[PDB]
């Protein structure tokens, strides 16, 4: 573990034997403790590991807001087209233009974002889009293809929830210059914007806040490799990503209701109500039966509503 650190820095830019005295055992540590301090600092100041994980969080966890509100605004018409119909030379030209025009311009590692259209959905066109990140050799020990697709599994689950309430909030202006759908839109908007808040500030954030501090007291690489996969298996557990497929079908009636309102009937709005409200009550029934996974209910209802 000593020389290997010396090589991922070199290519980029006395000991005696005694018995009953360890004048060499201590000598190896006085060098290994410098062999690491040059590499770790090499990753934080120049090509900014802790200053390298933050950049991935901005796009994968969608921390940076100015980049997505400007990217989906440009690449929406070219995503509703079906799969095997869109030219990647057309998307990447919009991704590059999305970063520079936004406030993500101050990012040294921004040039490692690549478009990767997955073949399968979250078990087309829009449900088959996800970023890909390529990293060099020495850091590839920590963030590798085995533990990067996990970053790509909890990304699409957040790009879906960000897309629906992006257009659900878009129909909000079209109707505002037949009159009983406003109290139903309230039932779905107060559901996604009550899942997103729990998903961003009380799930991944807390885990991330711990990891940053949990990497200051690291002692060896096979521990950092534990504080990382110990962070991804928690985000995928506290979220609904690990089954709970009722959420998948629950989202269908939300996005489809946006299509009906976009076709501008009175017997169809009330049809969505009995269908969506029934699907929601299936969620809180299963979210409650457990041994946080319980505080989510306090986020869904706050007025004692849905007390049935």
């Amino acid at each position: 573990s000593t020389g290997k650190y010396l090589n991922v820095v070199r290519e980029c830019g006395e000991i005696i034997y005694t018995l009953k005295e360890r004048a060499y055992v201590e000598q190896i540590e006085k060098a290994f403790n410098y062999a690491s301090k040059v590499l770790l600092d090499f990753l934080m100041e120049e090509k900014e590991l802790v200053a390298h994980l933050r950049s991935i969080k901005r796009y994968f966890l969608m921390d940076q807001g100015d980049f997505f509100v400007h990217f989906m605004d440009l690449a929406e018409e070219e995503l509703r087209k079906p799969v095997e119909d869109i030219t990647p030379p057309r998307l990447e030209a919009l991704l590059e233009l999305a970063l520079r025009m936004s406030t993500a311009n101050t990012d040294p590692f921004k040039d490692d974002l690549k478009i990767d259209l997955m073949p399968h959905d979250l078990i087309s066109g829009l449900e088959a889009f996800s970023f890909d990140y390529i990293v060099k050799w020495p850091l590839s020990l920590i963030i590798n293809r085995k533990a990067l697709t996990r970053y790509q599994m909890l990304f699409r689950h957040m790009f879906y929830c960000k897309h629906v309430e992006r257009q659900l909030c878009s129909v909000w202006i079209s109707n505002k210059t037949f009159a009983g759908a406003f109290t139903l839109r309230q039932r779905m908007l107060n559901f996604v914007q009550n899942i997103q808040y729990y998903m961003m500030f009380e799930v991944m954030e807390p885990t991330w806040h711990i990891l940053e501090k949990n990497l200051k007291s690291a002692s060896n690489i096979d521990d950092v490799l534990g504080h990382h996969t110990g962070f991804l298996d928690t985000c995928l557990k506290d979220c609904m990503l690990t089954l709970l497929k009722v959420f998948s079908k629950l989202m269908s009636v939300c996005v489809m209701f946006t299509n009906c309102m976009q076709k501008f009937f009175e017997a169809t709005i009330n049809k969505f109500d009995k269908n969506f409200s029934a699907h929601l009550l299936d969620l809180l029934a299963r979210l409650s039966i457990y041994s946080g996974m319980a505080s989510v209910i306090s986020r869904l209802d706050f007025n004692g509503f849905y007390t049935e």
């Binding site: 807001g65 509100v69 406030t103 039932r187 914007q193 986020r299 007025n303 509503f305």
Partner: protein
């Protein structure tokens, strides 16, 4: 998405001129419109730096101020003269619209109490004709005065897609209670604190709320109940701030229940005790909401400007705002029994009555139908 702002009348100019001064300092921008060396998204309000403002004898006071390189009393007089310069002021707004990438809104700052009342009534009508897809938020300020006030309310209840009330009366109390002033040059310092901290989530991008339509559609459930009041405590944990916002001593307003609450915490408070306080607010029951629809409270964090400590602002949609109207509605009938058709006032009179009824119907368990 850019937001082009408007300033009408002596009030709108003074609050906007002091709104920009609060923003120009919150960024590293010298009053000479030159960036100082000394991450914050600044493209929404500034054009690469020049503010996107369209002002309309206080103007000379700005041209003599060090910020010069940064750019009657009847309601009928305001609406009449506004028709005579229909093409003049729309030349400016149009040339400022297309030059922008993608217009998003029209934050309009005007007081409903002389010419700002009649002119603003003219603009909010004309914008909906040409621009039908542009949100129009207004930071209206509450004070023949009963006449000019309510007439603007006719337009502000069917044109403006949002409205933030800031009455001078309740502000004057906070000016007297915790500032001991006895002046316009002081109460506006509080107004500029409310206007700037309102759009703190647009200029500092976070997890959510990266666009104006994200702050609007969350609070306003229906096109009519679109009036919001504010609350600003710092004049310490998140529980200390959340408890102070709900006290009636802090709200800028002189049964009843909330509709939607959004909390803005501009501190460096760790994001782990954010759910604990919300859990506690539910237990002690410091606020009640509508019984018919599911109403929840939302809290949002942000980051203070390093170039300039925990603060807090709350965007509230409270039914008790209906009280401010009744004070206007009441004094109107008194002036209606004291002295070419005089029908616009009566037609405006009817629609305000439809609005107040809608509020008092919002607190009923059967507000639907």
């Amino acid at each position: 998405r850019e937001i082009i702002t408007l300033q009408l009348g002596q009030c709108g100019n003074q609050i906007g001129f002091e709104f920009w001064k609060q923003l120009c300092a919150e960024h590293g921008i010298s009053p000479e419109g030159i960036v100082e060396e000394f991450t914050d998204r600044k493209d929404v309000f500034f054009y690469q730096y020049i503010p996107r403002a369209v002002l309309l004898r206080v103007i000379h006071s700005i041209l003599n101020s060090p910020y010069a390189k940064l750019y009657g009393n009847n309601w009928a007089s305001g609406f009449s003269q506004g028709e005579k310069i229909h093409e003049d002021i729309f030349d400016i707004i149009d040339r400022e619209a297309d030059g922008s990438d993608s217009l998003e809104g029209f934050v309009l700052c005007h007081s409903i109490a002389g010419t700002g009342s009649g002119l603003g009534s003219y603009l909010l009508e004309r914008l909906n004709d040409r621009y039908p897809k542009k949100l129009v938020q207004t930071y209206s300020v509450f004070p023949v005065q009963p006449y000019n006030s309510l007439l603007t309310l006719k337009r502000l209840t069917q044109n403006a897609d949002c409205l933030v009330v800031l009455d001078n009366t309740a502000l004057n109390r906070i000016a007297t209670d915790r500032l001991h002033i006895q002046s316009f040059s002081q109460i506006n310092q509080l107004v500029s604190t409310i206007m700037s901290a309102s759009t703190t989530t647009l200029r500092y991008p976070g997890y959510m709320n990266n666009d104006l339509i994200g702050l609007i559609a969350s609070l306003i459930p229906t096109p009519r109940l679109h009036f919001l009041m504010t609350g600003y405590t710092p004049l310490t944990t998140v529980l200390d701030v959340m408890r102070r916002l709900l006290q009636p001593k802090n709200v800028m307003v002189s049964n009843h229940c909330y509709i939607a609450i959004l909390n803005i915490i501009q501190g460096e408070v760790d994001p782990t005790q954010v759910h604990k306080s919300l859990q506690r607010i539910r237990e002690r029951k410091l606020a009640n909401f509508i019984p018919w629809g599911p109403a929840s409270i939302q809290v949002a964090l942000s980051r203070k400007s390093p170039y300039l400590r925990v603060s807090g602002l709350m965007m509230a949609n409270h039914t008790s705002i209906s009280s401010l109207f009744e004070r206007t509605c009441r004094q109107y009938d008194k002036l209606r029994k004291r002295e070419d058709n005089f029908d616009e006032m009566d037609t405006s009179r009817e629609i305000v009555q439809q609005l107040i009824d809608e509020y008092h119907a919002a607190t009923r368990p059967d507000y639907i139908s």
